[PDB]
Amino acid sequence: STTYALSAAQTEIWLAQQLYPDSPVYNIAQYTVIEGVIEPAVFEAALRQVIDEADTLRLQFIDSDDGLRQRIGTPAWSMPVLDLTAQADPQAAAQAWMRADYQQPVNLTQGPLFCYALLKVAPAQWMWYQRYHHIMMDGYGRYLIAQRVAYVYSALCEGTTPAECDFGSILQLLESDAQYQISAQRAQDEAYWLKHCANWSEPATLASQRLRQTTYLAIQADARRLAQFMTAAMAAYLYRFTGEQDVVLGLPVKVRFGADRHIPGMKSNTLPLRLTMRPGMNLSSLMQQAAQEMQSGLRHQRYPSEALRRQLGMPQRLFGTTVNVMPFDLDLSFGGYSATNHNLLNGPAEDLMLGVYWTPGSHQLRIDFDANPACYTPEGLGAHQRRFIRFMQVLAADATQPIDSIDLLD
């Protein structure tokens, strides 16, 4: 049958998993707590329909004489139904079962790349467990699969047939990438990114399993320009703390190649953003420089960052900090009962990841620091978060004030 090549990121994930077969670092996990009753047969039927709809769950990765390939197959899976109403601590028992699952390493060749389970923790409260592998799923695809599961289960439980899928097939992305691999546009993007990152520097970093610290706040001062402001603020903070005038940040971009719908499993492309800190620069100048730099690499955004890393002299990172500004995911409804999503495991740490979560029509922001434990301590991460948030509030208070004259308090 038709086999397809792995992306550079998928190849790196495969190689790192084979080098450390005992590490469950590539496992992505979450659970949906549903306040009500669930019919498990209908849920399994919906799970099976969406598995065939989000066919990235049907992907099989082989290592044949051709090389490391991927193809659409029929994966063998099961949906266990657990009852914890008789346990002394039902929620703790569900947490223990989920932790027993997502802490097991998974063999990529022939082993279940996803695991679906249902856990009854109360007479009117269930827990839908979802575990994937990083080689075929990200966070947004995870939420989209959960949402489609909720919709299809609700449709099947109240008789009506579910409306058509609004996902594209993963093979659309596979064919698009196969054509782009031999494109002249890819050669142009490669040349541009090798010229733009020519020589360069050490990534300005605060580097000194995953460490996660959350802070809530509201500030006196739109998603695109909130991302602009957060990028400029983190770059200025790195410049003020490390003393580096050339700061490189990672900015994930949803690559657009003509796909009408979203394809679960289609990863983002984290592009390096180079920002130069000249003396006497304010937040206005830094934000406009960031906008111009994002515009300069806009037509070249499809070149994968892993290829740019490997095609350079890197054994090992273009950037130490990535900035992710995204709204909160909408809460879900199963049949008619409420359900909230709760994260268990996400992608492994690339040094430091800054997540900025905002809600429409409100001033409140949520700031998440997801750091690599080998280069950050909890106390250091907390001090960095506090200092950065205070410095960012000072920035937002006056966009014309020079960054050099801002007090960096600890």
Residue numbers in the entry: 7 to 214, 222 to 234, 241 to 334, 337 to 431
Original paper wording:
Nonribosomal peptide synthetases (NRPSs) are multimodular enzymes that catalyze the biosynthesis of diverse peptides with a wide variety of activities. The incorporation of an acyl into peptidyl backbone is usually implemented by a starter condensation (Cs) domain, normally located at the beginning of the initial NRPS module, via the formation of an amide bond to the α-amino group of the first amino acid residue, a process also known as lipoinitiation. Genome mining of two Cs domain-embedded cryptic NRPS biosynthetic gene clusters, rzmA and holA, in the bacterium P. rhizoxinica HKI 454 resulted in the discovery of two distinct types of lipopeptides, cyclic rhizomide A (1) containing an uncommon acetyl chain (C2) and linear holrhizin A (2) harboring a medium octanoyl (C8) chain. Similar to other C domain structures reported previously, RzmA-Cs adopts a “V-shaped” configuration and consists of two subdomains (N- and C-lobes) each representing the chloramphenicol acetyltransferase (CAT) fold.
Despite our successful purification of the dissected Cs domains of both RzmA and HolA, we were able to obtain crystals only for RzmA-Cs, and solved its structure at 2.3 Å in the P1 space group. Interestingly, in each asymmetric unit there are four molecules of RzmA-Cs with two different conformations. The overall structures of the two conformations are quite similar (RMSD = 1.52 Å for Cα), especially when the two lobes are compared separately (RMSD = 0.68 Å and 1.30 Å for Cα of the N- and C-lobes). The major difference comes from the relative positions of the two lobes (i.e., opening angles of the “V” as shown in Fig. 5c). This residue not only sits near the proposed binding pocket for the 2,3-epoxyhexanoyl chain of CDA in the CdaPS1 structure, but also fits well with the simple logic that a longer side-chain of pocket residue would correlate with a shorter substrate chain, and vice versa (i.e., R148 with C2, M165 with C6, and A149 with C8).
